[PDB]
Design a protein around this ligand. Structure first.
Ligand SMILES: [Ca+2]
Ligand SMILES: [Ca+2]
Ligand SMILES: [Ca+2]
Lengths: 124, 399
């Protein structure tokens, strides 16, 4: 896992843009698309969301805090099924949410980059 | 007769409960395959009570396969009689054909699969023998999978037990070893001359199918090219389009990846991998019943998940599944609202949804590029593969 320059959103969101990824200012944060012309590129979205996440979500510890996530799988193609991570982290009063997708032939991916990107995301 | 006399005398050359000599069995098989009146021969063996004897005395399962497949395939009016004799013979020898590569097919299923396969081959027009092809010797790197090589994924050695656990544990080196070999799709194409590309295409397409059921065919197994043409007519596609889709997959495939694809699918974990020539995903083949045109419903209702994964490693089944699925992705495209696929329209400005409903002879090239994207990835969700469209388009241009 690796990042370079930091990106700041008018809505008070601070994060680093992952190396090898193109970035785009989004409505409530940033979208990162893996660079090059890959067969099966990773897509990443990080956002401030003022509304809370739902219950029922199996959680995990994200450093000095707790994260709530869900992984969903759809049919994809040749490169494997589509896997979609949805993970949210408490930040002050609101929350920061990360979204990632990736195809896999070999079961659920770890989503390491997405988790790194969430954990190191700023509430200010 | 005129082959039953021969066969009748040959089986008198053994004990009642013991199996005939390997070479005698080979001679029975050959006689069966070389015979001009196969139904009559069956009817004859049955009159004399020699038909069941034949199944009892032959042989080890490797030779039982050849015998069963040969009879099931060449046979027609009298097929049911061969089917019935085999059934009574399995009372004694239960294991029959169900071992090795074929352990996921009960012996009666092996028979029915050979029957259905031979019938489809004559009917769809791919029964006829293919010339020996020059296969690649490669064992590593891009284009070293069954597409290039002829080596059935099912024949590859077991991945070392320890390495299997490293795979489950996501060990980077091990996962790299058993993964897609290409990152920069363009750089790979750049290093190939037009002659190199054409060579890969002929190697891919000119080889005999690597089939789990060789003796279901009247003579030798057909060229892959012939099977592709046949699937093309069946699905209103083009052998060039099927060829390009598969060439692309096979470029981004290795021998080691063939081993993981098949072994992980039939392992305790029944992984949901993509297998064989067109890299069909196991669950997709089940979901959309991709074998519909080669196997009748009776056989299809009975196939285990692991039998399906095994069939996908048989070239003719894989080619037909791949074609069925391409035609499915095209019909599904036909019915979209291009307005709701802005990124698709954006990436492929000459896309023509209506043309997808028809033959690819009249598809704009952007239709091939788009479908390539939506073959490697989920179809028509407006998320595109950035590199695959150009990759498949290069293969298509070669064809
Ligand atoms: Ca592959
Ligand atoms: Ca695969
Ligand atoms: Ca897609």
């Amino acid at each position: 896992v690796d990042f370079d320059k930091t990106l700041t959103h008018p809505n008070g969101l601070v994060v680093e843009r992952p190396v090898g990824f193109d970035a785009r200012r989004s409505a409530e944060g940033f979208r990162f698309d893996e660079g090059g012309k890959l067969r099966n590129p990773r897509q990443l979205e990080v956002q401030r969301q003022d509304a809370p996440p739902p219950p029922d979500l199996a959680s995990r510890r994200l450093g000095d805090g707790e994260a709530r996530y869900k992984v969903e799988e759809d049919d994809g193609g040749s490169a494997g099924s589509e896997y979609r991570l949805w993970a949210a982290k408490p930040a002050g009063a609101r929350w920061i949410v990360v979204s990632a997708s990736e195809q896999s032939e070999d079961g659920e991916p770890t989503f390491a980059l997405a988790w790194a990107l969430l954990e190191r995301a700023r509430l200010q | 007769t005129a082959t039953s006399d021969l066969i009748e005398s040959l089986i008198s050359y053994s004990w009642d409960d013991w199996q005939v000599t390997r070479q005698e069995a080979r001679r029975v098989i050959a006689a069966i395959r070389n015979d001009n009146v196969p139904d009559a021969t069956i009817a004859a063996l049955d009159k004399s009570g020699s038909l069941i004897k034949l199944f009892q005395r032959v042989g080890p399962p490797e030779l039982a396969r050849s015998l069963i497949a040969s009879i099931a395939g060449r046979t027609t009016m009298q097929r049911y009689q061969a089917r019935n004799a085999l059934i009574r013979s399995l009372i004694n020898n239960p294991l029959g054909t169900q071992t090795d590569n074929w352990i996921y097919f009960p012996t009666i299923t092996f028979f029915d699969i050979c029957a259905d396969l031979a019938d489809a081959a004559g009917r769809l027009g791919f029964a006829a023998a293919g010339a020996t092809g020059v296969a690649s010797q490669a064992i590593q790197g891009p284009f070293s999978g069954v597409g290039a090589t002829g080596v059935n994924p099912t024949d590859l050695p077991s991945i070392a037990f320890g390495d299997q656990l490293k795979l489950l544990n996501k060990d980077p080196a091990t996962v790299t070893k058993y993964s897609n070999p290409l990152g920069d799709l363009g750089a790979y194409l750049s290093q190939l001359s037009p002659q190199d590309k054409l060579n890969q295409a002929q190697t891919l397409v000119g080889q005999p199918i690597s089939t789990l059921f060789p003796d279901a065919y009247p003579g030798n197994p057909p060229s892959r090219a012939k099977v592709m043409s046949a699937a093309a007519r069946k699905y209103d596609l083009t052998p060039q389009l099927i060829g390009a889709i598969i060439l692309a997959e096979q470029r981004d495939q290795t021998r080691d990846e063939d081993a993981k694809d098949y072994q992980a699918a039939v392992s305790i974990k029944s992984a949901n991998t993509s297998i064989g020539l067109g890299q069909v995903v196991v669950s997709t083949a089940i979901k959309y019943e991709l074998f519909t045109d080669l196997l009748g419903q009776p056989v299809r209702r009975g196939l285990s998940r692991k039998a399906v994964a095994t069939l996908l490693a048989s070239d003719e089944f894989n080619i037909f599944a791949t074609a069925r699925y391409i035609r499915y992705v095209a019909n599904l495209a036909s019915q979209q609202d291009l307005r709701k696929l802005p990124k698709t329209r954006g990436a492929f400005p000459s896309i023509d949804l209506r043309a997808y409903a028809g033959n690819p002879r009249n598809w704009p090239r952007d239709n091939v590029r788009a479908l390539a994207s939506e073959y490697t990835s989920r179809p028509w969700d407006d998320n595109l593969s950035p590199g695959w469209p150009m990759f498949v388009d290069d293969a298509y241009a070669t064809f």
